Amino acid sequence: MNIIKANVAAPDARVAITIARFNQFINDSLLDGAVDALTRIGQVKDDNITVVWVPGAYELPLATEALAKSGKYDAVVALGTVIRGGTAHFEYVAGGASNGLASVAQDSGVPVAFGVLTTESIEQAIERAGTKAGNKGAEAALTALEMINVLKAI
Amino acid sequence: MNIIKANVAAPDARVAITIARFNQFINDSLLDGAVDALTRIGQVKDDNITVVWVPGAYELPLATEALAKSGKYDAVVALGTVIRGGTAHFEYVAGGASNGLASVAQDSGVPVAFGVLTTESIEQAIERAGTKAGNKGAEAALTALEMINVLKAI
Amino acid sequence: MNIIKANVAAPDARVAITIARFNQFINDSLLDGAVDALTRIGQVKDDNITVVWVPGAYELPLATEALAKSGKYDAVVALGTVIRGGTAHFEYVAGGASNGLASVAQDSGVPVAFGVLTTESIEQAIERAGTKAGNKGAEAALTALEMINVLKAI
Amino acid sequence: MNIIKANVAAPDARVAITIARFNQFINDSLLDGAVDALTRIGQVKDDNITVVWVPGAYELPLATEALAKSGKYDAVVALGTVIRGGTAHFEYVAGGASNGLASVAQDSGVPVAFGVLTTESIEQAIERAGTKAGNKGAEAALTALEMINVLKAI
Amino acid sequence: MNIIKANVAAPDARVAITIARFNQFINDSLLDGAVDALTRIGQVKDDNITVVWVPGAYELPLATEALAKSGKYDAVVALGTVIRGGTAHFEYVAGGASNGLASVAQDSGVPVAFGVLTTESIEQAIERAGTKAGNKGAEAALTALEMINVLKAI
Amino acid sequence: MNIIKANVAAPDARVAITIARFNQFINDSLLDGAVDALTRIGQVKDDNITVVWVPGAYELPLATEALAKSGKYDAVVALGTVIRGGTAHFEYVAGGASNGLASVAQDSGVPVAFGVLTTESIEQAIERAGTKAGNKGAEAALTALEMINVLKAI
């Protein structure tokens, strides 16, 4: 009975990170984690890493869509934070972002890593941006790499 | 390691704004903000700015879809307010509006700026229409411009 | 009837930022915002940007006074955080800082941007240092540039 | 992009300390901290350190003004404690003291360090006079030195 | 009666920093503080500063032990954060870390600076990583330098 | 200024895992995580992985001590669970185990990874054995590898 377990190391890869600058106070750490992950762990040569700042998290799809359709990249890591406010604006951003990104991956066949924090408080976001609950940035980066290989293995 | 940071200035652009006239009391300020942003900040020549009033916010997609498929515009800024009422009508308007718009952008490759307020009270809308919490109109306008360049940079 | 609306782009400008290192955990993001604002948005060439770290926020005036009297700069952005403690020390720091800076601008005719957080909690400061409520750093930077032009227009 | 970070060491400096004798039980430790800071850390030769006792904290300005107009000193450290009492006397002392001092620095161009405790209780003053919350004396002394260099660097 | 007061300036020194990457969101500021302290204050030439990232805070001892036994360094600054969780895991990490480090110093005769935050909340860690309660990174760095001299003075 | 960041890949390594069979219901997943980590991520050839079952978690030290003194291994990963009961037996097990292990590492210079759960409830242990809070097994395994390299880099 045959099995596929992939590895996160994948040096000959070219990876794109899309970050939202809104909330960058958090997103910065989110990046640091991802970049480090990519290079130090997945052996990515850091001139194959390209980083694209879009303004809001809402833009992440369009941006990563471009990058995937480009064919220039083996996977896109999508980094952002969306913290809930007084209105249901939170709902539609994080929604049209989750689904936007998921769609892009499904059509382009390129892995997209969902490294978007969707919290209730600034507190929680800090917790997932490189503290108690690890670093969703580095985590999304890793799941990106593994995915490259997982796919490549078919 | 290469990076893309875009700028909001983009004078040779032609931009389309779609506004819902329902709730115009708020949407009017939403516009003023956007228009000013576009011209004063993004250097847009104001005969490249075209403004399209549709009746409800629910119509924003169809209207912007037309504009994007037209190819005549580099980006569409979508302006509107949807305040929660006694029924779940609020849900389906803001929903089919967030997703409608998000889709149009994804297919047309044209950036669509989601400057649609989705509040609980008239109070909250006023807060986001050019007071305490800035002006989502001008903000959506800016994210539109930055996106033009962000894309252009690939 | 004649009107003056200025723009935030002003590339041939030389700008000075004064930062307090006390509370730098927050002030760092405050900076990043401002710097990015200046260059990416206001087209400032980054060797016309000079950054001066003073120890406490209380020192911001004297420091920016020097810079303005110097005439070497078109405007000074003042960055710092002052969080309220158990004593009224908070009052006199933020006071002697608001008024110190405001005075310097008034005598030197050089614009001084008041990008000093004055919060009740660490929580609030984080909110204004590049999260929910934007980035008072980049905001102060922008109001600086706009001012340059607003003045220049007379 | 050019930056100014200063150092606290500045041996060839001549510094003046003005202390209020009222509340000396606290102010004494306030001094010790400062003096030690100055010499041991900032390398100040202790015959360039001069110490001036005024009676109340209210007098700190006039005294430091003299010293700064004198030109004999590179900076003045102002040490004192003002604890809140039953009346609003507390308000006018700490007020006319914060602003007096701040003004002197602004006109004389000489750095003045605001090492005046402004507490609600004797308890709080003890906390900032060389216990849990460090020593505002030595802290004011250091911010003085750093300022000397920060200025000198323009 | 003879006395030893040391200074924090010690330029001809070679210093090693060991940081835990877990919780780096905080540890990053912890570092910045220390590095700045070292160079700007203690006059350390920044090619004599070496920085070693270990994964967990639990590893700090072993890593600093190596560095001290090496003899290549005059002191090691140990930076990390340990925030309390739902289990007593917190106890054994911070414990085996405090004692690990303390032991290494005692055997190697090399100063080891304990700049490890041991808090109850993310909130508290932020407070000690360069805000209200200063920067334990820079503070640990300073106590490192002073120690070098304190020892050297016997 | 020179820096050491290590990688978790280290294929030519020979690693020993010590597991306590008490509580194996949890420890089993703890292992699976570690083993997978080692091979799949750190490229360890799985005949260089040796696994040693000791009865209680209290024994983990003695067992790993032997293994490290043996010199046959580059690092030992210590896996086990200690859940708090009605008595303070919990205290002495987890204590004599944290310190035992930490000591072994310090004397043998071999890295020892502390992958011992120290929880209050069975619930919490399950959370850290490959669910919400990841898998301390695989985490301990990774910190082992990274350590090998971190040390090798001096």
Short mmCIF file of N, CA, C and O in Angstrom, two decimals, chain E residues 1-87:
data_model
loop_
_atom_site.label_atom_id
_atom_site.label_comp_id
_atom_site.label_asym_id
_atom_site.label_seq_id
_atom_site.Cartn_x
_atom_site.Cartn_y
_atom_site.Cartn_z
N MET E 1 39.32 53.14 52.62
CA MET E 1 38.50 51.97 52.31
C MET E 1 38.24 51.88 50.83
O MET E 1 37.62 52.77 50.26
N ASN E 2 38.70 50.80 50.20
CA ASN E 2 38.67 50.75 48.73
C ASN E 2 37.40 50.17 48.13
O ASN E 2 36.80 49.26 48.68
N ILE E 3 37.02 50.70 46.96
CA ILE E 3 35.73 50.45 46.34
C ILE E 3 35.86 50.10 44.86
O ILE E 3 36.72 50.64 44.17
N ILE E 4 34.99 49.22 44.36
CA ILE E 4 34.94 48.94 42.93
C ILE E 4 33.61 49.33 42.35
O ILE E 4 32.59 48.71 42.64
N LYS E 5 33.61 50.38 41.54
CA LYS E 5 32.45 50.72 40.72
C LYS E 5 32.93 50.51 39.30
O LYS E 5 33.97 51.06 38.92
N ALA E 6 32.23 49.68 38.52
CA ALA E 6 32.60 49.48 37.11
C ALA E 6 31.82 50.35 36.10
O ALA E 6 30.80 50.97 36.43
N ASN E 7 32.31 50.40 34.87
CA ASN E 7 31.59 51.13 33.85
C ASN E 7 31.06 50.16 32.79
O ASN E 7 31.56 49.03 32.66
N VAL E 8 30.04 50.59 32.05
CA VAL E 8 29.41 49.71 31.05
C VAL E 8 30.13 49.78 29.71
O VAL E 8 29.93 48.90 28.85
N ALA E 9 30.96 50.81 29.52
CA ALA E 9 31.77 50.92 28.32
C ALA E 9 32.93 49.93 28.37
O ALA E 9 33.66 49.85 29.36
N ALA E 10 33.08 49.16 27.30
CA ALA E 10 34.10 48.14 27.23
C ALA E 10 34.24 47.68 25.79
O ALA E 10 33.73 46.62 25.42
N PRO E 11 34.93 48.50 24.96
CA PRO E 11 34.97 48.38 23.50
C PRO E 11 35.77 47.18 22.99
O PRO E 11 35.39 46.56 21.99
N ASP E 12 36.86 46.85 23.67
CA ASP E 12 37.73 45.79 23.20
C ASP E 12 37.16 44.42 23.53
O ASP E 12 37.86 43.41 23.46
N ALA E 13 35.87 44.38 23.89
CA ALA E 13 35.24 43.13 24.30
C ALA E 13 34.63 42.40 23.11
O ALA E 13 34.27 43.01 22.09
N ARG E 14 34.54 41.08 23.23
CA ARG E 14 33.80 40.26 22.27
C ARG E 14 32.66 39.57 23.03
O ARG E 14 32.90 38.80 23.96
N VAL E 15 31.42 39.87 22.63
CA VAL E 15 30.23 39.40 23.35
C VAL E 15 29.33 38.51 22.51
O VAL E 15 29.10 38.76 21.31
N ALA E 16 28.78 37.48 23.14
CA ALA E 16 27.86 36.59 22.46
C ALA E 16 26.44 36.72 23.00
O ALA E 16 26.23 36.75 24.22
N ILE E 17 25.48 36.81 22.09
CA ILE E 17 24.07 36.81 22.46
C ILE E 17 23.42 35.49 22.04
O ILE E 17 23.54 35.07 20.89
N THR E 18 22.73 34.85 22.97
CA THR E 18 21.95 33.67 22.65
C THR E 18 20.49 34.02 22.79
O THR E 18 20.05 34.45 23.84
N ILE E 19 19.73 33.85 21.71
CA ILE E 19 18.30 34.12 21.72
C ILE E 19 17.47 32.89 21.36
O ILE E 19 17.86 32.09 20.49
N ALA E 20 16.31 32.76 22.00
CA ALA E 20 15.37 31.70 21.63
C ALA E 20 14.42 32.26 20.59
O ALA E 20 13.89 33.36 20.76
N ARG E 21 14.22 31.51 19.52
CA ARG E 21 13.37 31.98 18.44
C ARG E 21 11.89 31.81 18.78
O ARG E 21 11.04 32.56 18.30
N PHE E 22 11.57 30.84 19.63
CA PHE E 22 10.21 30.72 20.14
C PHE E 22 9.85 32.03 20.84
O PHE E 22 10.60 32.51 21.69
N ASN E 23 8.70 32.60 20.47
CA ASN E 23 8.27 33.87 21.04
C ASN E 23 9.02 35.05 20.47
O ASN E 23 9.07 36.11 21.11
N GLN E 24 9.59 34.88 19.28
CA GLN E 24 10.47 35.88 18.70
C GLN E 24 9.79 37.23 18.54
O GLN E 24 10.46 38.27 18.56
N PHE E 25 8.47 37.22 18.39
CA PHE E 25 7.71 38.47 18.33
C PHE E 25 8.10 39.43 19.45
O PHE E 25 8.12 40.64 19.28
N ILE E 26 8.41 38.87 20.61
CA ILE E 26 8.88 39.64 21.74
C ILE E 26 10.40 39.68 21.77
O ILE E 26 11.03 40.74 21.93
N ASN E 27 10.99 38.50 21.63
CA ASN E 27 12.43 38.38 21.63
C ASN E 27 13.13 39.30 20.63
O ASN E 27 14.26 39.73 20.88
N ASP E 28 12.46 39.62 19.53
CA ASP E 28 13.06 40.51 18.54
C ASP E 28 13.39 41.86 19.14
O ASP E 28 14.48 42.38 18.98
N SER E 29 12.43 42.43 19.86
CA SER E 29 12.67 43.71 20.53
C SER E 29 13.68 43.54 21.64
O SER E 29 14.50 44.43 21.91
N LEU E 30 13.62 42.38 22.30
CA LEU E 30 14.60 42.04 23.32
C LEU E 30 16.03 42.16 22.77
O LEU E 30 16.90 42.76 23.40
N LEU E 31 16.26 41.59 21.60
CA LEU E 31 17.52 41.73 20.90
C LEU E 31 17.87 43.19 20.58
O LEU E 31 18.83 43.73 21.12
N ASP E 32 17.09 43.82 19.70
CA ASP E 32 17.34 45.21 19.30
C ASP E 32 17.86 46.02 20.47
O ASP E 32 18.83 46.75 20.34
N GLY E 33 17.21 45.87 21.62
CA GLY E 33 17.58 46.61 22.80
C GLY E 33 19.00 46.29 23.18
O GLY E 33 19.82 47.19 23.32
N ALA E 34 19.28 44.99 23.33
CA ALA E 34 20.60 44.51 23.72
C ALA E 34 21.69 44.96 22.75
O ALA E 34 22.69 45.55 23.17
N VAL E 35 21.49 44.68 21.47
CA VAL E 35 22.47 45.08 20.44
C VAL E 35 22.79 46.56 20.51
O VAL E 35 23.95 46.95 20.64
N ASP E 36 21.76 47.38 20.43
CA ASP E 36 21.93 48.81 20.58
C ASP E 36 22.71 49.13 21.84
O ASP E 36 23.73 49.80 21.80
N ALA E 37 22.24 48.64 22.98
CA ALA E 37 22.96 48.84 24.22
C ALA E 37 24.47 48.60 24.03
O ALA E 37 25.30 49.52 24.20
N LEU E 38 24.80 47.36 23.68
CA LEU E 38 26.18 46.93 23.46
C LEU E 38 27.02 47.93 22.65
O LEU E 38 28.00 48.49 23.17
N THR E 39 26.64 48.14 21.39
CA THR E 39 27.37 49.03 20.49
C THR E 39 27.31 50.50 20.94
O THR E 39 28.33 51.08 21.34
N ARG E 40 26.13 51.08 20.87
CA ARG E 40 25.96 52.50 21.13
C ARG E 40 26.45 52.92 22.51
O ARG E 40 27.08 53.97 22.65
N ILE E 41 26.18 52.10 23.52
CA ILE E 41 26.52 52.47 24.90
C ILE E 41 27.86 51.93 25.34
O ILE E 41 28.72 52.69 25.82
N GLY E 42 28.04 50.62 25.17
CA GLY E 42 29.23 49.94 25.64
C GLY E 42 30.39 49.96 24.66
O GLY E 42 31.44 49.38 24.94
N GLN E 43 30.19 50.63 23.52
CA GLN E 43 31.27 50.88 22.56
C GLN E 43 31.78 49.61 21.91
O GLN E 43 32.88 49.57 21.36
N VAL E 44 30.97 48.56 21.96
CA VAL E 44 31.38 47.30 21.37
C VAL E 44 31.40 47.37 19.87
O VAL E 44 30.45 47.83 19.25
N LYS E 45 32.50 46.92 19.27
CA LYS E 45 32.58 46.89 17.82
C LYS E 45 31.75 45.72 17.33
O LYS E 45 31.91 44.59 17.79
N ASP E 46 30.84 46.00 16.40
CA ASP E 46 29.78 45.05 16.11
C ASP E 46 30.21 43.83 15.29
O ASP E 46 29.38 43.08 14.81
N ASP E 47 31.51 43.61 15.15
CA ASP E 47 31.96 42.34 14.60
C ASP E 47 32.52 41.49 15.72
O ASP E 47 32.98 40.37 15.49
N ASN E 48 32.47 42.03 16.93
CA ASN E 48 32.80 41.27 18.14
C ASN E 48 31.54 40.77 18.79
O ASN E 48 31.58 40.03 19.77
N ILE E 49 30.41 41.22 18.27
CA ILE E 49 29.12 40.75 18.72
C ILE E 49 28.73 39.59 17.84
O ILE E 49 28.69 39.72 16.61
N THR E 50 28.46 38.45 18.46
CA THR E 50 27.94 37.33 17.71
C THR E 50 26.61 36.87 18.31
O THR E 50 26.43 36.86 19.53
N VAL E 51 25.68 36.52 17.44
CA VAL E 51 24.32 36.22 17.85
C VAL E 51 23.94 34.78 17.48
O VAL E 51 24.02 34.39 16.32
N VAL E 52 23.53 34.01 18.48
CA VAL E 52 23.18 32.60 18.24
C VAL E 52 21.73 32.25 18.56
O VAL E 52 21.33 32.22 19.72
N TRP E 53 20.96 31.95 17.52
CA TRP E 53 19.57 31.56 17.69
C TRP E 53 19.43 30.09 18.02
O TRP E 53 19.77 29.23 17.20
N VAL E 54 18.93 29.80 19.22
CA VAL E 54 18.48 28.45 19.55
C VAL E 54 16.97 28.44 19.53
O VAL E 54 16.34 29.48 19.75
N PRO E 55 16.37 27.26 19.27
CA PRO E 55 14.92 27.12 19.11
C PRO E 55 14.13 27.52 20.35
O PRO E 55 13.40 28.50 20.31
N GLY E 56 14.26 26.77 21.43
CA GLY E 56 13.51 27.09 22.64
C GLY E 56 14.36 27.83 23.66
O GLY E 56 15.57 27.90 23.54
N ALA E 57 13.71 28.38 24.68
CA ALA E 57 14.44 29.04 25.75
C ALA E 57 15.17 28.00 26.58
O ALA E 57 16.17 28.30 27.23
N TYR E 58 14.65 26.77 26.57
CA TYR E 58 15.23 25.67 27.33
C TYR E 58 16.66 25.36 26.90
O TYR E 58 17.45 24.78 27.69
N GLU E 59 16.99 25.73 25.66
CA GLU E 59 18.29 25.44 25.06
C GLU E 59 19.35 26.47 25.40
O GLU E 59 20.55 26.19 25.33
N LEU E 60 18.92 27.66 25.78
CA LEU E 60 19.83 28.74 26.15
C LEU E 60 21.09 28.33 26.93
O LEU E 60 22.20 28.74 26.59
N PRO E 61 20.94 27.53 28.00
CA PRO E 61 22.14 27.09 28.71
C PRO E 61 23.14 26.42 27.76
O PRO E 61 24.17 27.05 27.49
N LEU E 62 22.84 25.21 27.27
CA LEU E 62 23.74 24.45 26.40
C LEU E 62 24.45 25.32 25.39
O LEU E 62 25.67 25.24 25.23
N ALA E 63 23.68 26.13 24.68
CA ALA E 63 24.24 27.08 23.75
C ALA E 63 25.23 28.06 24.42
O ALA E 63 26.35 28.24 23.94
N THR E 64 24.85 28.70 25.52
CA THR E 64 25.78 29.64 26.11
C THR E 64 26.97 28.92 26.73
O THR E 64 28.08 29.45 26.76
N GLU E 65 26.75 27.70 27.20
CA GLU E 65 27.83 26.91 27.78
C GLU E 65 28.93 26.74 26.74
O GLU E 65 30.08 27.09 26.99
N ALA E 66 28.57 26.21 25.58
CA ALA E 66 29.50 26.11 24.45
C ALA E 66 30.29 27.41 24.27
O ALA E 66 31.52 27.41 24.20
N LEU E 67 29.57 28.52 24.20
CA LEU E 67 30.19 29.80 23.89
C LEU E 67 31.21 30.22 24.93
O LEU E 67 32.26 30.80 24.60
N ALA E 68 30.89 29.95 26.19
CA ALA E 68 31.77 30.33 27.30
C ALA E 68 33.01 29.41 27.39
O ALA E 68 34.13 29.90 27.54
N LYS E 69 32.79 28.10 27.27
CA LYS E 69 33.89 27.12 27.24
C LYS E 69 34.83 27.43 26.08
O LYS E 69 36.03 27.26 26.18
N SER E 70 34.26 27.89 24.98
CA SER E 70 35.04 28.34 23.83
C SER E 70 36.13 29.35 24.22
O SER E 70 37.19 29.40 23.58
N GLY E 71 35.86 30.16 25.24
CA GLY E 71 36.78 31.22 25.62
C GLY E 71 36.86 32.39 24.63
O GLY E 71 37.50 33.41 24.91
N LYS E 72 36.22 32.25 23.47
CA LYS E 72 36.24 33.30 22.46
C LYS E 72 35.53 34.60 22.92
O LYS E 72 35.77 35.69 22.36
N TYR E 73 34.67 34.50 23.94
CA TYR E 73 33.86 35.65 24.37
C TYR E 73 34.07 36.08 25.83
O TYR E 73 34.37 35.27 26.68
N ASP E 74 33.90 37.37 26.08
CA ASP E 74 34.11 37.97 27.41
C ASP E 74 32.86 37.90 28.27
O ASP E 74 32.91 38.15 29.47
N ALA E 75 31.73 37.60 27.64
CA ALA E 75 30.44 37.53 28.34
C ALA E 75 29.36 37.08 27.36
O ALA E 75 29.45 37.32 26.14
N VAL E 76 28.34 36.42 27.89
CA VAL E 76 27.22 36.02 27.07
C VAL E 76 25.94 36.66 27.60
O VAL E 76 25.67 36.59 28.80
N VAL E 77 25.18 37.29 26.72
CA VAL E 77 23.85 37.77 27.07
C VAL E 77 22.81 36.76 26.59
O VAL E 77 22.78 36.41 25.41
N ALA E 78 21.98 36.28 27.51
CA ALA E 78 20.96 35.29 27.18
C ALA E 78 19.57 35.93 27.11
O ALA E 78 19.05 36.44 28.10
N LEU E 79 18.98 35.92 25.92
CA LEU E 79 17.69 36.54 25.69
C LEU E 79 16.61 35.51 25.34
O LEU E 79 16.80 34.66 24.46
N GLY E 80 15.47 35.61 26.01
CA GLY E 80 14.32 34.78 25.69
C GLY E 80 13.10 35.20 26.49
O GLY E 80 13.19 36.00 27.43
N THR E 81 11.95 34.68 26.11
CA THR E 81 10.73 34.95 26.86
C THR E 81 10.09 33.61 27.19
O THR E 81 10.08 32.71 26.33
N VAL E 82 9.59 33.49 28.41
CA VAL E 82 8.80 32.31 28.81
C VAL E 82 7.50 32.76 29.45
O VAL E 82 7.49 33.25 30.57
N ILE E 83 6.39 32.63 28.72
CA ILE E 83 5.09 33.03 29.25
C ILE E 83 4.34 31.83 29.79
O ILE E 83 4.32 30.76 29.17
N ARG E 84 3.70 32.01 30.95
CA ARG E 84 2.99 30.93 31.63
C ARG E 84 1.77 30.45 30.86
O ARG E 84 0.97 31.25 30.37
N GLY E 85 1.62 29.13 30.76
CA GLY E 85 0.48 28.56 30.07
C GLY E 85 -0.45 27.85 31.03
O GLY E 85 -0.43 28.13 32.23
N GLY E 86 -1.28 26.95 30.50
CA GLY E 86 -2.23 26.21 31.31
C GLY E 86 -1.59 25.12 32.17
O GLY E 86 -2.15 24.69 33.17
N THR E 87 -0.40 24.68 31.76
CA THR E 87 0.31 23.63 32.47
C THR E 87 1.55 24.16 33.19
O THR E 87 1.95 25.32 33.02
#
